[PDB]
Amino acid sequence: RHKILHRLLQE
Amino acid sequence: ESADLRALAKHLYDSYIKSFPLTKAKARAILTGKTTDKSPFVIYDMNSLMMGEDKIKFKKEVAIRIFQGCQFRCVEAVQEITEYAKSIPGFVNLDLNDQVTLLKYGVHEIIYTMLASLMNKDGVLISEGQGFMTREFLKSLRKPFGDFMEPKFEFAVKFNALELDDSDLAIFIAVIILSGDRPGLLNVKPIEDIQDNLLQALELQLKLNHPESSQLFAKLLQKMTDLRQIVTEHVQLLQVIKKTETDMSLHPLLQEIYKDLY
Numbered sequence: 213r214h215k216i217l218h219r220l221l222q223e
Numbered sequence: 224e225s226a227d228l229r230a231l232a233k234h235l236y237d238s239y240i241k242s243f244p245l246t247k248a249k250a251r252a253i254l255t256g257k258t259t260d261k262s263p264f265v266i267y268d269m270n271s272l273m274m275g276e277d278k279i280k281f282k283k284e285v286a287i288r289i290f291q292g293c294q295f296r297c298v299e300a301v302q303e304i305t306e307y308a309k310s311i312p313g314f315v316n317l318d319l320n321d322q323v324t325l326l327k328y329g330v331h332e333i334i335y336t337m338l339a340s341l342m343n344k345d346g347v348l349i350s351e352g353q354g355f356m357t358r359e360f361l362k363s364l365r366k367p368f369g370d371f372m373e374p375k376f377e378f379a380v381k382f383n384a385l386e387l388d389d390s391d392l393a394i395f396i397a398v399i400i401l402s403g404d405r406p407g408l409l410n411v412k413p414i415e416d417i418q419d420n421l422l423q424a425l426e427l428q429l430k431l432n433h434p435e436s437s438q439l440f441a442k443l444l445q446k447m448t449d450l451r452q453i454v455t456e457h458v459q460l461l462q463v464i465k466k467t468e469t470d471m472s473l474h475p476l477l478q479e480i481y482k483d484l485y
Contacts, residue, residue, distance in 0.1 A: 220306075
């Protein structure tokens, strides 16, 4: 579920 | 009014400078030679490519190696674009699922937009402007890699004609990200509310910063509809490349983006 994109947005 | 739209154009510019190391400003200086810095290493064949390992970051065959290079950099672009998006007022306040969707579809459109900053009819600047890879060298690659970059050059030639600068591009890029018509958005209204605002900001910028160029705004919005068609061609050539080529693995972040796309 777009883990890296999620992390890049969250960070 | 004007004020609020100038303030936005300024906020976006400042954020663009921070997010993107190599602006169009620096890029043009390098390409014209008008820089007081060293001319970049010209890669025009397998020989010059080999001699130019000392200026690039790859971290087995040429076309594949070049593609792994273009893959590495393309991932740094998504990170740069992602941080830029986080600076677009109200983007973060959106549904996190929407933020993902906008980026998912937006990044390729913005990569081809900002590639044009690094391009001319003869070639493209690489490794932060300290390399220059020639168009003819990228055509001469064995298929399907043979004409992977050619359609980007074709677009950039037409797009660079508009003579946009960094302050224009900052807003143009924001407008592309806030496209309320991406497949699978959940809350379109607050996306369109921001884009609406960005488009006014863009229109005003183009009047103030190119007051001789009339309906550059109109011309620029026509180009924005080309990029999609252009990005679909790219997605499918990559679809092909994934299948036909056994050896090369595709970077996870790219896989996240390209899977369930067109």
